[model samples]
Target chain A: XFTGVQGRVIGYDILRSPEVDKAKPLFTETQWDGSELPIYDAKPLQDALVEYFGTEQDRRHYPAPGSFIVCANKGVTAERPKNDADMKPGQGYGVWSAIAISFAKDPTKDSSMFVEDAGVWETPNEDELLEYLEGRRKAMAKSIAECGQDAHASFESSWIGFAYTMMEPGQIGNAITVAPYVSLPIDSIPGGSILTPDKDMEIMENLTMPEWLEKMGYKSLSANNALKY
Target chain B: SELDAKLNKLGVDRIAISPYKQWTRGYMEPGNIGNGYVTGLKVDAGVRDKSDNNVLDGIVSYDRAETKNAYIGQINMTTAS
Candidate 1:
């Protein structure tokens, strides 16, 4: 699907005591076509956590069954009800409150970890997100292999955790690795439409692939011949 | 209740808050959203409750990333974000 799963808002949550065991989360299932899942789920959150994490060793990483479990998830999307006037289709995506649990230990060893497509949080130089998804996919394959097509296995993971904590260049004095573009003033861009002449010109002026890398102060492996040939 | 009755007549989905708050102000700055460029949404700094009988401070202009035309009244400014 051209539909991409991108994490918009990533944040942290601290489960208060064992109360979270009874914490019923409110969220909706969003399909790719931007259609609503209709009903929301308020299931036993602890069970979802256990079902999501799926293993005793991993379970141990969860905040004490009665302890505070750390949680996080993607925030809102830019969707809303039908725009009756002008046949205006909604842009962006909309979302109910959604969050995911991250590291569980409060003052001790964290039995759980998160990794991204290339780097894992906490562990420098590790692709945390990619490894987690890869592991989950492998586990799914294993489950299918063991029990035909009937049974399934899965893991509950959330948005890029490390990003929530990482500092942006504009946010700090250090050179930033990523930053939002400071767009030209609204009046300067004609009608200021996305594809309008002046806007497109500005984008062309700014969209140089290689220059952005250097502008953002990132070094390509090719530049240093560090990529394994 | 009166506001609800009237907005229903004008055909609005549930109302949204003022997108013009200081914290959310810069959101109006245009950016490359996707394949298309979107001029940031524009709205009048709401006339506080007292003068105008109209509860809807409508979106004057909003360019969607996927669509060519700016949909007027796609959003109501009377509500606060």
Candidate 2:
């Protein structure tokens, strides 16, 4: 039996836990517009994020409203922060791993798959692989087009070699905010295309699906000869 | 040695590495403390069947400590007031 935390990509928002108050607020109350909406200074919020989620060098931007923030606990031991001002590490404060993903609509359906065979193979059949990837890409595109730009499209993940359902949106929370959602281009989604090495030692980007397969030494064959051991 | 020689002959000199796939179990929302102030969020674990996709088997059980184990929420960014 496998044991780990799993959840759908919920809408992005700052966690307003007790530790936030310990960090110094970067923006002043005067700087905030006099709106009744609760105002939080960005500096303390970002510092808390850095403490919880280790820093990423190139991650200069934050997820916009309506974006999906997927997170999982590292399951490491930690000490919880006390109510007082003493902010020490390892007092029960553990780190969390998180990423931001976007969907065209509020994902309402369950999507899952499982790979029956798992292993590295030499000269995998290119056509069959491409056909499978193309089908997935088209499905993802359809999901985005049909769902809209800011909602969860589907809940999906793989277990062992087989992908299976773990959770779905709306199982926990209701739709509260309809903020603008921005996401990466469909082709730019991570895991959509396999990366290939180039002459300059940088990843060769933006290659067609077939080109990506060919670059990785996969070949199209008329018969099963490519499977020779 | 034979496999190395075959690969060398075929000009397959370098090994390509792929990124690991990420698996997540549940969604997290702001756990409101009071008056719209949120100090942390609660995480719910997903349940799955082990035998025949029906019988109960795989599961994630959270630690009893709420502040220390369960509510390790990360504040991504703040909205304009």
Candidate 3:
């Protein structure tokens, strides 16, 4: 028997937290057509944090109710529902995307830290990874404070935002690494469609890789190096 | 196999295995794509309402290397397997 794993890093973003009061409503009570919509909420995320880190100190290490952080999405191949009828809302059979957020205070400084790879069969424990992320957050914060704004700017644009993993049953482990392409932000609607909208498509289509990177505060890499991948 | 050769091209290493599992769920939004990209996920509130502690554990478990996101849905790994 054989099992396969594959993953793709879709894109990166410097998530700026909207004020708690101003946060986008998770879902609408009714659509324009007056159809009922699935109710979504952020309370689970809050509860998860509270449960995971019982102490206020530990909880403080994570993002606040409204703090900008780093986020990345990846495409993964998953087993389909037993049959189409069994598929639930938000469930899919083929390549589907999932998102992950960094616990770092300034995730963009070393954005690669949040990249996920489904291909790798084995990895360090999650607890260990969280510790490493906290360390990076502190180290990067110190670097920015000591080295000044120029250093901060360099770190922001230096990350190469791509990774992958490949694994199979009975394999000892798997391989994971960054892809050559620079991470670019894809357009999205807040709390909206899973499919990319035409307006977002236009934004993506209109900008070249370099142009996109430039717009995102990426300045460390040369134009040649920026698009080399 | 062909995959092994491709792995070599990427210069990856093989190491010990660890038990792993991932659960993924998707959501759809129905509005205009704005100027910004997605910064975080708004997970369904009911997932946490379940009694199983493992559900929350899986949701939070992820590598913190040079990558990060807002709220990962379902990912958990254990050595028990």
Candidate 4:
């Protein structure tokens, strides 16, 4: 079932049934100014991801050989790419949200085991999102071709909020590829669940638990107030 | 309103409150990252005896990231009204 966050899925379509939790269709790019950007097809964006990861069983997975792919959404024309705003309106106008693959790995691994993922990607221009990912995929493919498939590699999204950390190819031992793992929703009750949209809800931020509890309506009285005899 | 103040009331069916905050600048995304300003507490009027309350027995926890706001805490309570 495709719940809030699921990985290693064969395909989103097969899992998007009414009975199962589905991925909400994210349509229209909302700009930083609270304006909606031009509507772009979510298909190409998703398809490009599928192709980059090589389908449920039709392709190869990146970082398969303990190497990494640097994926960053930055200015396309800067001397070097970064996680900041380097892209302007017309210069590289399109292609943000890039995905670099860690392709120097073993393609001989069981194809059915690879899981493709769309790392925390958010952009107003849907067109450039897809193009950017494709471009990164090309760069990775070129690297894979240059180096043997057994090369150690990994991946990097290059954004603080959008990237997954502590885990990647070169970062961990023999992390050759990126795989999807099911993020099971918390079972707050039998047949019920409690899940936060933010993977780690920043609770207790700037406030301790006791301070928070008091704020939650748990009031206290002084010793004199208790001696109301 | 306070929980016990309402709980000590007559004919109270249930009390359910949720703590929410605004953490992002977008529609549907509610809650600040760590500002601690809590709102949107849902209070369900209780109807049954305290011993008969069975809704609070659930235990579930999950975290997800979306384009909108971040959620911190949640609460759900029920009583046979």
Candidate 5:
């Protein structure tokens, strides 16, 4: 199905971080993507990346690729929870909490996010991956209260790791991408309200994919990736 | 007790705090989150409380990223040299 992902807050110009800013240099310098040119800045080519990374179950959680991201969202809260219990299934997508979603896939639309299509698989560039992680965290922190109504905001290697992602400009410039959207399940709330003051929390668990993955004995983030090594 | 009752009435799901025992690494500006464009969320809710209102204080955490209220993307990046 189609899934939506994007960023929440980011600094522009000189307000950006030195370490994070250094990454921009690589976008133009590295010969990643598909050409000798730094595929990073080639937003024209970056459009093809989301399809290669997210949308499956494996890449969403455990590092089937043998590496976990060392991502940091600049806008996350800096304090630890006063008590661990404060962080429940419905409440901790913030950096202040350890809970996170790696990446996600929706089955209803038959389309995927991060790439806009299905089956294409690979790892995302470090720079872009960083953006997705940070952006996703921001989305979660902003939406968790709403999402909690349908799903308890807890930590999932895959869900928290990929709650959402930033769409590359190339994806926009090219016809390959669609509007940055989120496609978790959309089930009716108890009172027939699709959205309570909180969003659809239980929807996160209304998945047919997870059961199928377990049936296949699938484990690790790779199980989440649409393509395999 | 205070926070639990207050939050329940407000329909809050869960409250969170930083997981890092030492508070570092989060983005910070000089002001509070409400000063920026974080809409929907109440200004009184995200405020940095120094007093002892369990629900208001326990659930709230301090952060400053919204202070600048700007958008910045990385410029040049390379995974490999």
Candidate 6:
């Protein structure tokens, strides 16, 4: 099921979901390189992140691939293009408080904090926030086109589908291509889920561990932090 | 109100930090958040917790930026209702 950040999956349908996590998973290596690749979906993703920047010095760097994609919000998402902002604004889209994806080799692990990101707004004198993001719209397109720049080339090979968020009790992952793996609120899991939206609540209730478990192998995800193509 | 103090504080305490200062044609007064002042300090946390609660030793070795006034090297305490 789609959670904070998942990658490379198959088909997904956004019409019946909350958020989607696409990566075109089912496509074999040859297929991805051949027919499966980013087509032109004006998502808000950017190779050079605009938020989470520190001093100009810090702005000069980027998050290494394989980092964890922590869900900054608790809300669910459906198939829709989301901008990078916080969900506190009644579940809209924006990249300000959006989630991030990493392979599993993220370097700034300790510095990263997973918190319930609300939403974004105009700062006192920084009205250029929107302008800056528009710049990203141009850049993200380039990054997707140039897949292997910051992460593995396989990430974009096949996972490009929308998701249908389960409405009742539980919901969530691969938009449509990764369908069969969708998580049902009351049903059991495909293979014993490793992530959940209620994670924080579980910790508070002594029902789960607090460590970010993103080992390796194969997994998929999504969020409202952004929109789709 | 001395020239040196004013110079150090940019333009505070009724003095213009610079001899060639004219914020508003020539009225020298410091605002709560002034444009003039060298306010910066660093202190060890646990080390300053001592001093028996009254006498300030190496206390105030640090200061707050963005914040203006502070009593450096002063022994202090507060009473609240």
Best by lDDT: 5
lDDT of each: 0.25, 0.22, 0.25, 0.21, 0.26, 0.21
lDDT of 5 at A121: 11
Indicate the worst ten consecutive residues by lDDT in candidate 4 chain A: A167-176
For each of the candidates, give the backbone clash count.
25, 28, 22, 45, 67, 55
Q: After aligning candidate 2 to the native by TM-score, how far in Å is the CA of A62 from where it should be?
A: 20
DockQ, prediction 4: 0.01
Residue lDDT tens for model 2, B13-77:
22211122211111223321111111212222222212222112211112211112112223332
Lowest lDDT sum, 10 consecutive residues, model 5 chain A, at A112-121
Predicted structure 4: lDDT: 0.21
Error of 4 at A80 (Å): 17
DockQ for each model: 0.02, 0.03, 0.03, 0.01, 0.02, 0.01
TM-score ranking from best candidate downward: 3, 4, 6, 2, 5, 1
TM-score (0 to 1) of chain B for each candidate: 0.18, 0.17, 0.18, 0.16, 0.21, 0.18
Off by over 4 Å in 5: A1-61, A64-68, A71-210, A214-229, B1-47, B51-81
What tens digits encode model 3's per-residue C-alpha lDDT throughout A1-229? 0001111122222221122223343332232333332222232222222221122222211222222222333333222233333434333222211112222223323222222223221222545443443344344333333333323322221111222222122111111221211112221112222344333433533444334445644332222222110
lDDT of 1 by residue, A52-155 (tens): 22356433222334553222212222222233212123221111122122232221211112211111122212355335433433332222122111111112
What TM-score would every model get versus the actual structure?
0.18, 0.18, 0.21, 0.21, 0.18, 0.20
For model 3, fnat equals 0.01
Model 6, residue B43: displacement in angstroms?
38
Once model 5 is optimally superposed onto the true structure by TM-score, how far is the C-alpha of residue B65 displaced, in angstroms? 4.2
Encode model 3's per-residue lDDT on B1-81: one tens digit a residue. Answer: 233234335543111111111111111111212222222222111111122343332332223211222232222211100
Residue A65 Cα positional deviation in candidate 3, in Å, after optimal superposition: 9.1
lDDT of 1 at B8: 72
Error of 1 at A203 (Å): 2.7
